[PDB]
Ligand binder design. Structure first.
Ligand SMILES: SC[C@H]1SC[C@@H]2Nc3ccccc3N21
Ligand SMILES: [Zn+2]
Ligand SMILES: [Zn+2]
Ligand SMILES: [Zn+2]
Length: 231
C-alpha cells in the first residue's frame, strides 16, 4: 500500500500515515530520463507539525504544503533538512516564505552554500561528533557519522518506533550504489553500525528513496556500499 514511484506524477505529493501522528511524504523527480521517488517525514508536535526534508524542489514543496493543509490541517511550524542535497533542501525558500522555521546542522548549511543550494535558516547545535543525539520537539536527531554525505542526519520518532534514515539508508530493491559523489564509503558501514546500536528497537525504517521496511535495511545498505567499495 506504500506509494510507488509509478503512482506519483512529478509535481504531485502523497502522504502515507505510518502511526498516530506520523506520516511520510512521497514525491517524484525526473533525472537523466528516469523517474525517482523521494521520502520525507511529518511528525505531529501537539497542535503543530514538524517536517523532515523538502519534497525535492520548490514546486513539489508547494504541493506538499498544500497536501498537508488538505489532509492534516495542522500548521507546519518547523522543518529539518537531513543533508545538503536538493532533495532535502530544495524547497527551503518556499517553506521560509510560508513562515516555516527551517533548520539544519551548521555542516549542512555550509555544504548547501558551497553547492549553491537553498540554505536552512537556523543552525542545529549538538550534532558535530559522530554518535551525537539531540531532542527536537517530538523527534530525536542523530548524527551517525559520515555516510551518504559527511553531514547526514537520521531521525527517530520514539512514540512510534519510526527510524527515518534519509539517504544514508537504501531501500531493499536498490542493489547498486546510488549518488555517492559526496559519500564517505570508508566510514559508511561504521556509521550504520552506530544507527543500529542507538535504535535497535526501531520497527519501521524509512529510506531516503523508496519503500520502507525493518532494520534489515541497515545491513542491506552496508552490503550494497561494501560491494560498491570493491567494484
Ligand atoms: S541524494 C540527492 C538527490 S538530489 C539530485 C541527485 N541525483 C539523483 C538521482 C536519483 C536519485 C537521487 C539523486 N540525488
Ligand atoms: Zn543526497
Ligand atoms: Zn526563525
Ligand atoms: Zn537522496
Amino acid at each position: 500500500e506504500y506509494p510507488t514511484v509509478s503512482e506519483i506524477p512529478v509535481g504531485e505529493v502523497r502522504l502515507y500515515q505510518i502511526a498516530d501522528g506520523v506520516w511520510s511524504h512521497i514525491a517524484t523527480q525526473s533525472f537523466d530520463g528516469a523517474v525517482y521517488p523521494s521520502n520525507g517525514l511529518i511528525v505531529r508536535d501537539g497542535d503543530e507539525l514538524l517536517l523532515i526534508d523538502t519534497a525535492w524542489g520548490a514546486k513539489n514543496t508547494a504541493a506538499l504544503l498544500a497536501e498537508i493543509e488538505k489532509q492534516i490541517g495542522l500548521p507546519v511550524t518547523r522543518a529539518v533538512s537531513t543533508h545538503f542535497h536538493d532533495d532535502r533542501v530544495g524547497g527551503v525558500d518556499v517553506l521560509r516564505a510560508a513562515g516555516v522555521a527551517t533548520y539544519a546542522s551548521p555542516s549542512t548549511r555550509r555544504l548547501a552554500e558551497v553547492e549553491g543550494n537553498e540554505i536552512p535558516t537556523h543552525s542545529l547545535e549538538g550534532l558535530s561528533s559522530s554518535g551525537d543525539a539531540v531532542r527536537f520537539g517530538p523527534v530525536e536527531l542523530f548524527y551517525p557519522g559520515a555516510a551518504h554525505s559527511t553531514d547526514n542526519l537520521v531521525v527517530y520518532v520514539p512514540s512510534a518506533s519510526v527510524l527515518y534514515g534519509g539517504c544514508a539508508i537504501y531501500e531493499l530493491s536498490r542493489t547498486s550504489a546510488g549518488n555517492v559523489a559526496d559519500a564517505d564509503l570508508a566510514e559508511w558501514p561504521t556509521s550504520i553500525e552506530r544507527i543500529q546500536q542507538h535504535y535497535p528497537e526501531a520497527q519501521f525504517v524509512i529510506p531516503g528513496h523508496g519503500l520502507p521496511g525493518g532494520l534489515d535495511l541497515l545491513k542491506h545498505t552496508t552490503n550494497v556500499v561494501k560491494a560498491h567499495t570493491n567494484r
